[PDB]
Amino acid sequence: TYKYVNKKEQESEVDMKSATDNAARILMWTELIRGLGMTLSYLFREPATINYPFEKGPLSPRFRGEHALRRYPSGEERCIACKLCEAICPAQAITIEAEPRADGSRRTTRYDIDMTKCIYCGFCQEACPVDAIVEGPNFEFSTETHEELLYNKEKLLNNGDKWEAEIAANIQADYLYR
Amino acid sequence: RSRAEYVVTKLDDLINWARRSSLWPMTFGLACCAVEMMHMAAPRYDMDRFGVVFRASPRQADVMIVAGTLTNKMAPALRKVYDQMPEPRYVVSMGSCANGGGYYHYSYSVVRGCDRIVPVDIYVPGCPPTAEALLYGILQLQRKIKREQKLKIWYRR
Amino acid sequence: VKQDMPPPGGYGPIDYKRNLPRRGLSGYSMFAVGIGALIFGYW
Amino acid sequence: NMTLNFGPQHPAAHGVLRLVLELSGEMVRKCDPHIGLLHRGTEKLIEYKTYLQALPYFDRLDYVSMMCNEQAYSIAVEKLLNIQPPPRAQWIRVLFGEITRILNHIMAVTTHALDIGAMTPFFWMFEEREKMFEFYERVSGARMHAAYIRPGGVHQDLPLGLLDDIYEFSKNFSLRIDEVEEMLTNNRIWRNRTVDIGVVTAEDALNYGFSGVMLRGSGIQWDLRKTQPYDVYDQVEFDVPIGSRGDCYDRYLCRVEEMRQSLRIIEQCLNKMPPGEIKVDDAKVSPPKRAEMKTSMESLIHHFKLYTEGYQVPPGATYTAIEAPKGEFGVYLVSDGSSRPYRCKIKAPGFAHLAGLDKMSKGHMLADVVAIIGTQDIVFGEIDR
Amino acid sequence: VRPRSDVTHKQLSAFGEYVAEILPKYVQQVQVSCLDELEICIHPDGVIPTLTFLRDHTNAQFKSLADLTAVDVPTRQNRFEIVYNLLSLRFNSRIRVKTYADELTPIDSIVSVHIAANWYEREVWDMFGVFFFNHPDLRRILTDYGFEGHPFRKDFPLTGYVELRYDDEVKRVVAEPVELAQEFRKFDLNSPWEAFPA
Amino acid sequence: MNLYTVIFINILLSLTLILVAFWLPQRLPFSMKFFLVAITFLLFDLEIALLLPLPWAIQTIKTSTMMIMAFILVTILSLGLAYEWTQKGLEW
Amino acid sequence: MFFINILTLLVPILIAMAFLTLVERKILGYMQLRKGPNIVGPYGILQPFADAMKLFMKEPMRPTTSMSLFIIAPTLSLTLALSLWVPLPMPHPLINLNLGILFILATSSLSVYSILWSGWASNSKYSLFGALRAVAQTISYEVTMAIILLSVLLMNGSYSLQTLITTQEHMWLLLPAWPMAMMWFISTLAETNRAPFDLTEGESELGFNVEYAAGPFALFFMAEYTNIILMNALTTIIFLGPLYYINLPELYSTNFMMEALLLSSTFLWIRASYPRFRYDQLMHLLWKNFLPLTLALCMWHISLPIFTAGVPPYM
Amino acid sequence: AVIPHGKGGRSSVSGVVATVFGATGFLGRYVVNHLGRMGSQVIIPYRCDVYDIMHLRLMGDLGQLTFLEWDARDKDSIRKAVQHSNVVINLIGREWETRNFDFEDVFVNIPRAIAQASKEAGVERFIHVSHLNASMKSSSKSLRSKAVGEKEVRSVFPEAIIIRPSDIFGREDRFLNHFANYRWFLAVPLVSLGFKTVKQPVYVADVSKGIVNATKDPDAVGKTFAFTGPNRYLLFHLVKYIFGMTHRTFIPYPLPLFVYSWIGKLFGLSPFEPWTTKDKVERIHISDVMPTDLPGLEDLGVQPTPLELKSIEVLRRHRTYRWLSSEIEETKPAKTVNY
Ligand SMILES: NC(=O)C1=CN([C@@H]2O[C@H](COP(=O)(O)OP(=O)(O)OC[C@H]3O[C@@H](n4cnc5c(N)ncnc54)[C@H](OP(=O)(O)O)[C@@H]3O)[C@@H](O)[C@H]2O)C=CC1
Ligand code: SF4
Numbered sequence A: 001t002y003k004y005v006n007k008k009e010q011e012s013e014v015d016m017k018s019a020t021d022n023a024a025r026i027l028m029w030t031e032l033i034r035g036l037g038m039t040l041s042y043l044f045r046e047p048a049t050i051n052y053p054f055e056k057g058p059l060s061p062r063f064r065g066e067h068a069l070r071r072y073p074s075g076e077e078r079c080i081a082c083k084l085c086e087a088i089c090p091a092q093a094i095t096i097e098a099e100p101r102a103d104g105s106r107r108t109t110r111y112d113i114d115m116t117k118c119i120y121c122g123f124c125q126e127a128c129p130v131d132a133i134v135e136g137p138n139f140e141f142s143t144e145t146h147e148e149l150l151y152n153k154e155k156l157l158n159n160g161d162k163w164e165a166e167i168a169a170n171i172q173a174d175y176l177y178r
Numbered sequence B: 001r002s003r004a005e006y007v008v009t010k011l012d013d014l015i016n017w018a019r020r021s022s023l024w025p026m027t028f029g030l031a032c033c034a035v036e037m038m039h040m041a042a043p044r045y046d047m048d049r050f051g052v053v054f055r056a057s058p059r060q061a062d063v064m065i066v067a068g069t070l071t072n073k074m075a076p077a078l079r080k081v082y083d084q085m086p087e088p089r090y091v092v093s094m095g096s097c098a099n100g101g102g103y104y105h106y107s108y109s110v111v112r113g114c115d116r117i118v119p120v121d122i123y124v125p126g127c128p129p130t131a132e133a134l135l136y137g138i139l140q141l142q143r144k145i146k147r148e149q150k151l152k153i154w155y156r157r
Numbered sequence C: 001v002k003q004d005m006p007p008p009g010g011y012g013p014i015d016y017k018r019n020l021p022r023r024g025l026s027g028y029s030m031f032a033v034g035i036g037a038l039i040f041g042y043w
Numbered sequence D: 001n002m003t004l005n006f007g008p009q010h011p012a013a014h015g016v017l018r019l020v021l022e023l024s025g026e027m028v029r030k031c032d033p034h035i036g037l038l039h040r041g042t043e044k045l046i047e048y049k050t051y052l053q054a055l056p057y058f059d060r061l062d063y064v065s066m067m068c069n070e071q072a073y074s075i076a077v078e079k080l081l082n083i084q085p086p087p088r089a090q091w092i093r094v095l096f097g098e099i100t101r102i103l104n105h106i107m108a109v110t111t112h113a114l115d116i117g118a119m120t121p122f123f124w125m126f127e128e129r130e131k132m133f134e135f136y137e138r139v140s141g142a143r144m145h146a147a148y149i150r151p152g153g154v155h156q157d158l159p160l161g162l163l164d165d166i167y168e169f170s171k172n173f174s175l176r177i178d179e180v181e182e183m184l185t186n187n188r189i190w191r192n193r194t195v196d197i198g199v200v201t202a203e204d205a206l207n208y209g210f211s212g213v214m215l216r217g218s219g220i221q222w223d224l225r226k227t228q229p230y231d232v233y234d235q236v237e238f239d240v241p242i243g244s245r246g247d248c249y250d251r252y253l254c255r256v257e258e259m260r261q262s263l264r265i266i267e268q269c270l271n272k273m274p275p276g277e278i279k280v281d282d283a284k285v286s287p288p289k290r291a292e293m294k295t296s297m298e299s300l301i302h303h304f305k306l307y308t309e310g311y312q313v314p315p316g317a318t319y320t321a322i323e324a325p326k327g328e329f330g331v332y333l334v335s336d337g338s339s340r341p342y343r344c345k346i347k348a349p350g351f352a353h354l355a356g357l358d359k360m361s362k363g364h365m366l367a368d369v370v371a372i373i374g375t376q377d378i379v380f381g382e383i384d385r
Numbered sequence E: 001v002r003p004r005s006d007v008t009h010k011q012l013s014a015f016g017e018y019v020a021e022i023l024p025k026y027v028q029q030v031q032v033s034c035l036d037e038l039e040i041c042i043h044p045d046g047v048i049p050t051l052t053f054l055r056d057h058t059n060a061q062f063k064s065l066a067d068l069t070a071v072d073v074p075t076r077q078n079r080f081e082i083v084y085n086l087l088s089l090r091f092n093s094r095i096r097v098k099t100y101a102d103e104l105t106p107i108d109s110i111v112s113v114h115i116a117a118n119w120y121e122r123e124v125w126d127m128f129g130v131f132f133f134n135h136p137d138l139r140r141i142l143t144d145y146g147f148e149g150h151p152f153r154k155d156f157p158l159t160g161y162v163e164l165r166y167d168d169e170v171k172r173v174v175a176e177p178v179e180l181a182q183e184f185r186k187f188d189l190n191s192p193w194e195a196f197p198a
Numbered sequence F: 001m002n003l004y005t006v007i008f009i010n011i012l013l014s015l016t017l018i019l020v021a022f023w024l025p026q027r028l029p030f031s032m033k034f035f036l037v038a039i040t041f042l043l044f045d046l047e048i049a050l051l052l053p054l055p056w057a058i059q060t061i062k063t064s065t066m067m068i069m070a071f072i073l074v075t076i077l078s079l080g081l082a083y084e085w086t087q088k089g090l091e092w
Numbered sequence G: 001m002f003f004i005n006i007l008t009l010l011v012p013i014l015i016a017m018a019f020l021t022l023v024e025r026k027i028l029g030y031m032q033l034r035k036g037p038n039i040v041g042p043y044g045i046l047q048p049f050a051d052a053m054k055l056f057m058k059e060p061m062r063p064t065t066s067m068s069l070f071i072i073a074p075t076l077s078l079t080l081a082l083s084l085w086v087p088l089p090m091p092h093p094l095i096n097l098n099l100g101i102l103f104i105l106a107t108s109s110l111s112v113y114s115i116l117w118s119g120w121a122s123n124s125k126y127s128l129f130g131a132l133r134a135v136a137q138t139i140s141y142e143v144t145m146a147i148i149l150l151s152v153l154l155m156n157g158s159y160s161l162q163t164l165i166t167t168q169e170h171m172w173l174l175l176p177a178w179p180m181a182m183m184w185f186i187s188t189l190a191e192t193n194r195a196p197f198d199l200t201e202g203e204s205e206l207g208f209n210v211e212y213a214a215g216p217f218a219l220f221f222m223a224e225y226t227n228i229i230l231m232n233a234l235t236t237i238i239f240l241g242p243l244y245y246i247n248l249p250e251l252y253s254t255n256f257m258m259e260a261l262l263l264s265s266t267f268l269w270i271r272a273s274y275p276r277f278r279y280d281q282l283m284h285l286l287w288k289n290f291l292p293l294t295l296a297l298c299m300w301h302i303s304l305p306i307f308t309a310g311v312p313p314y315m
Numbered sequence H: 001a002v003i004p005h006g007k008g009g010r011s012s013v014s015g016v017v018a019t020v021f022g023a024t025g026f027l028g029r030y031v032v033n034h035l036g037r038m039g040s041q042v043i044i045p046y047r048c049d050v051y052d053i054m055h056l057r058l059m060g061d062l063g064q065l066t067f068l069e070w071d072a073r074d075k076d077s078i079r080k081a082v083q084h085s086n087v088v089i090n091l092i093g094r095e096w097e098t099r100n101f102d103f104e105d106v107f108v109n110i111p112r113a114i115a116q117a118s119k120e121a122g123v124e125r126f127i128h129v130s131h132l133n134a135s136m137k138s139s140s141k142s143l144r145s146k147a148v149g150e151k152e153v154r155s156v157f158p159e160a161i162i163i164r165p166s167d168i169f170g171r172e173d174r175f176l177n178h179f180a181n182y183r184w185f186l187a188v189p190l191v192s193l194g195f196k197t198v199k200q201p202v203y204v205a206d207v208s209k210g211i212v213n214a215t216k217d218p219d220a221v222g223k224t225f226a227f228t229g230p231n232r233y234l235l236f237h238l239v240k241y242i243f244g245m246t247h248r249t250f251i252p253y254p255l256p257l258f259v260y261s262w263i264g265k266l267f268g269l270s271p272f273e274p275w276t277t278k279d280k281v282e283r284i285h286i287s288d289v290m291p292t293d294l295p296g297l298e299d300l301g302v303q304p305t306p307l308e309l310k311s312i313e314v315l316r317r318h319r320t321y322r323w324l325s326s327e328i329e330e331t332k333p334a335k336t337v338n339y
């Protein structure tokens, strides 16, 4: 099904009345005045902006935001170094090397997410079997120096501890969907 | 209070406030991060409110937001525009493509970061760094500009 | 069971066609206004 | 014709375009656009990545139409596997496919005006855009660059409540398009700077491979969505907005009309989206549900192999083209039996359109060039790839 | 499992024979994928002739060039596989004509047949190095102005050999041999087990 | 003098600004069309001159001659314009 | 005293000049669904002063140039614009000039140079062209601008702006001569390079500010906005005549205040509402659409007096 | 130590952790450049606000350049800077005795405390930089004071290399820009009409490369190298040559120094970085000493670079649009004076 836009169905022959109406349109800029009315109208509408520090634009539970590594309630970090979070990262951001901890458990000696390399796809959130690496809600982590953006296990684990309460609520809300 | 030190602390506080309140952003509009700021310029998160003007020519520009990948063909230009900006000048690197290479880090045509090309003041993280996130980064530039004490250093120099 | 779906009976109808209103004073009448101003103004 | 090297002056933007030009005073004699200021390697990088980890590249190829691009790779990978997405996923993709078209047109029409000099339409519609992004975020997690449309369907069902809001918005957006209109469609001045600028003949448009509104604006009737239906765009009913006297103004009117027609398609999708699953049930292609991978051995094995290694698409090659908002977006994906692709030339509606800048802007003023770059919706990501 | 209509695999198949018959001097192989897509294969010399017949034949009008690309099979003597995908708005069908070109054996240019190819042919030269005779203006499009090497060739390193940084001493951007701070981790992904006879 | 006083303050205010502004911080573009316009401009600018005394000339006792003269001037220049339009001039 | 009367009539205008940018960055805002600048100071009142201090502190790059034009030009733009407020007859003028409107027309004409000088002074061939656009349009629009005034004067009787207060004691000159008001308003929009007619600073870089940053940028800048007011104020004396009572002179200035602000608000409203015209589209209007209208209506204003026996009283 | 791995460019390792206290300087900028290029760990003590040291960030790689807040009067700041460095390079110097820092401080007092701590730390080597021809009796307080230092630091730090550069030629240098900037002055005073003060400039990079090479070579210990240059010059040709490339008239008019030392005193009174210095003036007319000494350039591995070769880049900013395109070939060379 098609539709002609800007196709004049027929040649309306000028009638004085028509001509006057048109000539008035050119002479007294009638349509231009129409446009001014629209903007005056909004001037009276409530502005949609938010006080950025005081009010925040709404983000729902799946917002990917900033990486964090979670821990079990007991206090044992969730990651067991299966290293498929490294395998599926599209940007090669996550670097993981592991060795059996003294307890005998499997754990990662080094877990480094290069956030400048990361493109926040959220697949790592997807891939983890124990769901140790999660996309945390915080988006405000702008840093003065490039090195700060590179994150080792201690920053991510600390990021995990700080935001665990909200991360748990967010995962709680969206897990049925996944 | 009465001390040549107090007068020189208050007056930079004045000079810093002027630069902080009116930052005109020059936006190298590479890739897509430029859109995530066109959203900052837009009504939900106005930037003008904060004194940041929508768009100013390079010559008139206090900050340079580098949004998007800096390829090896645009690098020679960014430096030119950074070099031609007026002296008081600051750079905000937006996007994992610009602060670091991001997806496309290992490409043969992408500079792995704009920090290699232009000195960078605030690095805003995120593939499309959210628009509040840029606004937080611009506000962090304002916190960095408040702390600067140029007059104090000249007095005790 | 519970999945996000259209409400029973379907949603209501949404307008897509242009609704620009052809609202204005007729041209002859318009001319008269300005002309009258001049005619009077001159007198 | 003193070369001015205009475009590194951020004058029409849409990316970074060095439009070296030779201008006898204010008349353009020849335009030789330069490209690659945003080449990043997207085509070579994909060869070194698995099918699912190359999906995020497609969102970045032309990111104003974030998802519609993802659908083209999806379709392509589904064809190679001879798998099809489940019924609900198809409707979703058409739902977010259209929402994305609006997003692109709001970008193209309002950014066109900002270069022309009208600035209030951009702020009016960027607020509506914003509201749409929020749909993306509440469905994918990201405002833009979602990664929601994956090769076997959508990633996760819509949140419980989105459809209702994609209604409230749709119920009103029209008036917003109407307003822009009262400001530009008939402005005594928009018409002038746009009418009879960059007229492209019908035969020439097909010859230079324009394939988009640019063809439709010249009166050629071709919407790959009606001619070669993809997903369930066949089950909906919409009217292609064909144009006559093709010129910047006519095509514009066409883009405002598809914004209108997409609201007609969105309405339907909300009215008729089926109950069902949003991803193929073949754990072979689609990753297993997390409850299943945490309780069933075959599901863990399928989760581990899918994320670590990949789909393992059967050897073959396909060119699948959809109707991305800009025009025909196609992926020629040659594939060996391996889990990572062999080639993935992205046909960008835009590589062809820019080329036409020369044959469109002839004997035109500096301001005309600015208007024509706008009427091609050039996103340098797709052109540079 | 995708729905497949054999109406197309029959229509397209027949057309293939029709093209082949009409252009037997160049058509080497004409196949229809299981995905209902035709792919006439032509000797490189048949570039001009086969395209022109498809652009201007009443029973096969293929007016627009969707794409021109060149896969690179390094094993294949003729490294590149120029592939031209065409669309027929009249018959709502697409066909692909693919030829083979080695590095220093140029292909003819079709800018005459379709001017769409003016840019894509420059793109193929820049990335793969195939040369197109009779091209109006062949010159690098996507790569940097001084780039050495053709990037999409399978034998070109992803990271490449040169990267750019600003040097104060010389106050100008300067290439240096690439030094990467985390090399691309080359995960081996192929499994040692096949899937089906194919 | 009163004007002189005002004007020198006016220059002083501007020179003050530029001075502080510089002290506080411590080839062939030619189109006959453009030349042609400048010319037309003066032909019109001169006419503006021959038309400027009209406020004093209104009070002239003649009146008939005044208008007869003024109408002829405006008409002959406008015809100049007319030929400018007719010719490629004014068509940039 | 006279000196005090120079502070007033200058500072007050400069302070008001600063508050126009603010009322521009908020009225454009609310029209575009955004608050505009309210965070610095209260409701953005300190916002104009803030950017002024940033601009002066930044390096006057002085980018390579002809130096004494990079400095003289900005000064001419501010000097002429602030100077043209010297004779405005807000109630009583400051320096009453018998040939006042010729002073305003002549002083405006001189500003076209600043554009020409700044464009030549930068060494960017681009700028050389950008200045050409403004310089050409300025003189062009000047030709209809002048003729429109000559029509007015002939119905006022003199060149002195003070006479119109006595001419408009019964009716605004808009009623009569409205057809020219519109044409004076559009020409006032061109001569202040405001939006509908703002090709300068257009696609060139969205011309004679290209190389101008910090203090030089500011001075023209200030000039433009003061002009924006002055020309609007001339509309509010010549065509919209504020009520004058000899017993209380300030209701004249009170209404002059109200009409000037509204017409100043109008060009702010015009800017947001309209796309910018093409370079030739702009000259096509003046030489084709307006100049024939103005020249003919000019003759009608030499005839209206005579045969309606209304020749205006000199003095 | 740090075994040197890599190919040689950025993102590689050379194993030189080096505190460099006066890096912000014209010479400094260059020292950090090579050290960063080589891949060395560079600690840059700074006192000026961060805004001014940004120019040093892009040099060197991530985590290769570390900036520390430091005050000369506060001994503790120097202490922590050299805590983990194994090479200390001292470029602290000024031409104008500032209100709160005297030539002694900038040259002898401070540069002592620094090396003193460096020893306490156990830094393998310290490189101290003092001006060329620096007698303990030289006229300019500056030169003499510098001489005083090179002695002292030897007692605080024995076997501490002491490179002694001549006035340096480089973009952003004074030697070349100062003269070129005499344009503002209608006449360009030249003591003895610019004669009998033969001068041998040395490119900044040569100096930098030399300095860097010192850091990575065992041959230099207690060595007092003298980077000099590839050709000497009577101040006359130098001045004119400069004006030559700048394409600005050259009007050599002799000025009795006794009066000129007074002119230096004048600008010297300037609060904001006096442009000329009484101590400068003397230095400028202080004849370059002869080259009989532990050789510097070449000896340390870099062949000096003639002035004319790169002069075009240093003096270009001073030309006018008319001469911008002009090139070195068009212009003439100056003449050397083996004297
Ligand atoms: N022509 C030349 O340049 C020659 C130089 N030399 C020697 O080489 C050295 C480097 O010269 P150059 O780079 O030109 O010198 P600069 O004038 O560039 O300053 C060098 C560094 O010293 C720092 N500095 C100066 N005074 C103090 C102080 N009181 N406290 C702390 N830091 C201070 C400065 O830091 P900040 O600016 O932050 O205060 C600056 O970064 C000098 O010491 C000089 O004696 C020798 C011969 C010729
Ligand atoms: S996947 Fe989850 S668990 Fe396995 S390694 Fe990555 S993070 Fe640790």
Ligand code: SF4
Pocket (backbone or CB within 6 Å): A119, B030, B031, B032, B033, B067, B068, B069, B094, B095, B096, B097, B098, B102, B103, B126, B127, B128, B129, D060
């Ligand atoms: S960072 Fe993510 S979003 Fe910003 S440009 Fe690179 S890819 Fe596009």
